[PDB]
Design a protein around this ligand. Structure first.
Ligand code: HEM
Ligand code: 8AW
Length: 449
């Protein structure tokens, strides 16, 4: 089993019995991945316990697996762990079930819908400003994640279900999904357990989170079913009259999670950058003022007008792609771009690493929004820079997240400035676990303008 990459003649760190190359995750697997890239070059193999994982870095090879051979050979992400009813969630579902869930849910994020979520969020901008304006008094540090997390929550519920639960006025989901903890280490390493827990009804999500979201999303549901907008919660009612009940809740939980957790983490990273780069912060405050004269209310079209904003957002995502790695399980023997990949292998694209490769980026540790200007934008390979994945299985929420973040940014910057305080971590360190987090909360002071 551990003979695979020696047999295919693919380079790699030497696996230990049982553990595989697991111990190398000790100092976080963005580092492991960087090390590997440097040490082995363009393609390598390692073992999550007994699982062979082939890393590929060739822009062409990546396009083939992400785009060309998706439907046929590379359709599914890793077999994750013990999901429960979340088996149905779109990001977890495989093969046919996924295709069906995809075109069922993909119309959720069209122009018209998006355009129709600009006024809905437009009330949450007004409550985010107000929250911060109150927090500008004390003049002490601040936790961006906490104030930003509640914004995300509010936007997600109100659009996807059209349910205002006014989170911004009420100070589960963060307790949802540990590497050091024997847990994922006993599964990421050891998968043979999984079918057991599926009978034990044990879940990667605590029973109490999903039970809440269960009866809660069952409640946002009831209200609709009698009283007489074509939205997310509405779209899934369409299919029920070939969708089902727990399949409806499943999609909801992923969406609530995605929209809450990622949106706020990214927004924290951007603010961190704008403080630690005030010139960039000013240039943006300028653009915002140029497009929106007089602290005016952002809009769908005025949002797309802002080039430098988009450049800022893109460059944060170069440094801090919250996914680390894209993955695709190889479901039949295959030969892509002159390389043989056997059925069963997990093909891995090390996004964080390629986003930092001395090859495609000069000065790759530095935050340089300009590397994204219309002048330079075309020298950038859509297959080295993939914060949203690519091909059919790419991020369905991309356009919502970008607009939502930007709406959060426009309004916040047309009202406030951001500066490091003494409880700001300069520079920033990543925590070692799964998705990209800062090892200490991002904390910054906030002047009124
Ligand atoms: C800045 C915030 C976000 C980032 C950086 C982001 C990034 C990604 C990435 C890299 C993937 C995998 C694509 C692939 O493997 O090719 C992904 C998948 C997905 N994302 Fe997004 N995402 C973000 C926000 C969202 C939002 C707001 C939603 C919807 C509410 C969303 C829903 C999904 C779903 C359902 C999948 C799995 C797609 C499928 O298999 O059909 N994520 N996300
Ligand atoms: C490598 C094994 C690891 C356990 C794994 O497969 N998970 C990651 C992380 C996936 C987690 C899974 C999850 C956590 C908590 C609740 C539900 C599911 N994140 C996830 O699917 O979030 C939805 C998102 C969409 N866009 C960004 S996050 C792979 C992945 C899937 C989808 C998008 C990006 C990366």
């Amino acid at each position: 089993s551990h003979g695979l990459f020696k047999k295919l003649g693919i380079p790699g760190p030497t696996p230990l019995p049982f553990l595989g190359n697991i111990l190398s995750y000790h100092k976080g697997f963005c580092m492991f991945d960087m090390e590997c890239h440097k040490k082995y070059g363009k393609v390598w193999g390692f073992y999550d316990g007994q699982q062979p994982v082939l890393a590929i870095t060739d822009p062409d090879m990546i396009k083939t697996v992400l785009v060309k051979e998706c439907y046929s050979v590379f359709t599914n992400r890793r077999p994750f762990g013990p999901v429960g009813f979340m088996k149905s969630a779109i990001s977890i579902a495989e093969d046919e079930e996924w295709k069906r869930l995809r075109s069922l849910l993909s119309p959720t994020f069209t122009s018209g819908k998006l355009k129709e979520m600009v006024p809905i969020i437009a009330q949450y901008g007004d409550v985010l400003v107000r929250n911060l304006r109150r927090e500008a008094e004390t003049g002490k540090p601040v936790t961006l994640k906490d104030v930003f997390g509640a914004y995300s929550m509010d936007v997600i519920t109100s659009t996807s279900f059209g349910v205002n639960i006014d989170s911004l006025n009420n100070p589960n989901t963060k307790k949802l999904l540990d590497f050091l903890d024997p847990f994922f280490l006993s599964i990421t390493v050891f998968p043979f357990l999984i079918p057991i827990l599926e009978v034990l009804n044990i879940c990667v999500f605590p029973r109490e989170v999903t039970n809440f979201l269960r009866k809660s999303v069952k409640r946002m549901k009831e209200s609709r079913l009698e009283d007489t907008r074509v939205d997310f919660l509405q779209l899934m009612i369409d299919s029920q009259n070939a969708l089902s009940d727990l399949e409806l809740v499943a999609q909801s939980i992923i969406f609530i999670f995605a929209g809450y957790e990622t949106t706020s983490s990214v927004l924290s990273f951007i603010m961190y950058e704008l403080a630690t780069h005030p010139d960039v912060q000013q240039k943006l405050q300028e653009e915002i003022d140029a497009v929106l004269p007089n602290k005016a209310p952002p809009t769908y079209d005025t949002v797309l007008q802002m080039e430098y904003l988009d450049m800022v957002v893109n460059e944060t995502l170069r440094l801090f792609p919250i996914a680390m790695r894209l993955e695709r399980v190889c479901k039949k023997d295959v030969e892509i771009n002159g390389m043989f990949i056997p059925k069963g292998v997990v093909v891995m694209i090390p996004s964080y690493a390629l986003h930092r490769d001395p090859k495609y980026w000069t000065e790759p540790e530095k935050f340089l929004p300009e590397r994204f200007s219309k002048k330079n934008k075309d020298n950038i390979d859509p297959y080295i820079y993939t914060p949203f994945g690519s091909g059919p299985r790419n991020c369905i929420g991309m356009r919502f997240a970008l607009m939502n973040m930007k709406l959060a940014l426009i309004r916040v910057l047309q009202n406030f400035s951001f500066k490091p305080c003494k409880e700001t971590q300069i520079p920033l360190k990543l925590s070692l676990g799964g998705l990209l987090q800062p090892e200490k909360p991002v904390v910054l002071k906030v002047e009124s303008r």
